[PDB]
DNA sequence: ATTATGACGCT
DNA sequence: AGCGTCAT
């Protein structure tokens, strides 16, 4: 009763930003906008793999893992923008520079934590206490929520989807207003204001839309973004969260999609998050240990702690390539050119980030996988980044590995490499 | 023959 | 440390 946490302490949202990938090549040429559209890495094998696609395009059933020639076959008027290629590779830069024009203008509004290249988790409680002391008891007007949703509303004693929206939304405003909500309420729905506002700010500044989720954690919130996209926001109030897990697949909660997730449904015999509250927390901890038992206890019950950290930054800079089927590396000299084009555009991004972020790595580390070898890495050595220089980190990365070649003849390498992979880690302010 | 990333947990 | 899991 009285001493039972609710998990309804803190306003947190999710960003992520849509289609991302795309609308980065939409804004740079106009030609693609409102139009089907796909990225595409390379392009001699099957037409390219398509790593980002319109939502226009997506309506035809184009999906990300596709190979071009095979979405061409849904969508024969597809618009494609390739992937630069520099040194011989894929290389991402564009993306991770719009990336940062967002990430800037968010952490203009609160401290944000980067969970990918376009998605962000913003602690919006200080925020929010703001807000209130300034609205001064002042209602909030649904003007102030032009694209929120209110997951689990409308309900109770219109067919348009936009109508829907509102009727929700007016529900939600009307039982705040008559005092029928609770303070976490209020403290959530002055969050979805603010983060219109930061919504807005994205778009108007980049050109780029985004979803957003509002909730009192991070899985909540990241749950919410996905429920309506794209360009638009859900409320995920902790009320909304025994209906809303009551049909839940367990695999759409972040860390459950893989086996964990897969072990508590043939373990427990369960397939919905909500199913979860039947078991005590020790059941729980004696299935999926100690942490995953207690997180998961908590987490059915809508409420988790993980902090959003302040991180704005990514921890690690990394470079891969892969070499598939008759591509694999089967001698020495090619094995030492590919390290070299990773280690130069490596240095390349590093010196940049250097200048930018007032800090140095200090270690390397090599990653190689091996012809046959089950797993997506076979091997990782790390040894010492003392200089920003791209023929050193590529000798010292061949030093490595060198010896993993199991060929008697020392020119050639066996059994051949399937992938190069460098990663500059342990940053020290500079 | 998805590819190129990136954070965090285990022992 | 080196490996594995989960995720964009
Ligand atoms: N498996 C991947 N491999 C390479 N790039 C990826 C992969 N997944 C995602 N990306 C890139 C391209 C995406 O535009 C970008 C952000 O990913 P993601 O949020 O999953 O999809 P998205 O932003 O394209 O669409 P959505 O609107 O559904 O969020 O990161
Ligand atoms: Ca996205
Ligand atoms: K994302």
């Given at each position: 009763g009285p001493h039972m946490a609710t998990g309804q302490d803190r306003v947190v949202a999710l960003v992520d930003m849509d289609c991302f990938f795309v609308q980065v090549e939409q804004r740079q040429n106009?030609?693609?906008?409102?139009?089907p559209c796909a990225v595409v890495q390379y392009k001699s094998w099957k037409g390219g793999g398509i790593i980002a696609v319109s939502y226009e395009a997506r309506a035809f059933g184009v999906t990300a893992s596709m190979w071009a020639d095979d979405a061409k076959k849904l969508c024969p008027d597809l618009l494609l923008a390739q992937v630069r290629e520099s040194r011989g590779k894929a290389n991402l830069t564009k993306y991770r520079e719009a990336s940062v024009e967002v990430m800037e203008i968010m952490s203009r509004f609160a401290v944000i934590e980067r969970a990918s290249i376009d998605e962000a988790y913003v602690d919006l409680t200080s925020a929010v206490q703001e807000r209130l002391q300034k609205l001064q008891g002042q209602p909030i007007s649904a003007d102030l929520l032009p694209s929120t949703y209110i997951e689990g509303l409308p309900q109770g004693p219109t067919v348009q989807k936009e109508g829907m929206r509102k009727q929700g939304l007016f529900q939600w405003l009307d039982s705040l207003q008559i005092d029928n909500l609770t303070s976490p309420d209020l403290q959530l729905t002055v969050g979805a204001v603010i983060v219109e506002e930061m919504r807005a700010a994205i778009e108007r500044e980049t050109g780029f839309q985004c979803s957003a989720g509002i909730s009192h954690n991070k899985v909540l919130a990241k749950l919410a973004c996905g429920l309506?996209?794209?360009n638009r926001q859900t409320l995920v109030s902790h009320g909304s969260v025994p209906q809303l897990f009551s049909q839940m697949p367990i695999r759409k909660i972040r860390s459950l999609g893989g086996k964990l997730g897969a072990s508590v449904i043939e373990i427990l015999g369960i397939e919905y998050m909500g199913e979860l509250t039947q078991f005590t927390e020790s059941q729980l901890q004696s299935h999926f240990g100690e942490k995953n038992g207690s997180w998961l206890y908590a987490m059915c019950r809508g409420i988790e702690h993980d902090p959003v950290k302040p991180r704005q930054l990514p921890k690690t800079i990394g470079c891969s390539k892969n070499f598939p089927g008759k591509t694999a590396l089967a001698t020495r000299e090619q094995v030492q050119w590919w390290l070299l084009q990773l280690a130069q555009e490596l240095e390349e991004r590093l010196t940049k980030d250097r200048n930018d972020n007032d800090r140095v790595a200090t270690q390397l580390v090599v990653s190689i996988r091996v012809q046959?070898?089950?797993?997506?890495?076979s091997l990782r050595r790390c040894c010492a980044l003392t200089r920003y220089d791209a023929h050193k980190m590529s000798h010292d990365a061949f030093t490595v590995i060198k010896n993993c070649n199991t060929s008697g003849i020392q020119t050639e390498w066996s059994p051949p490499l399937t992938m190069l992979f460098l990663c500059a880690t342990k940053f020290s302010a500079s």
């Open positions: 106009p030609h693609l906008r409102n139009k309506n996209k794209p046959g070898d089950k797993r997506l890495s």
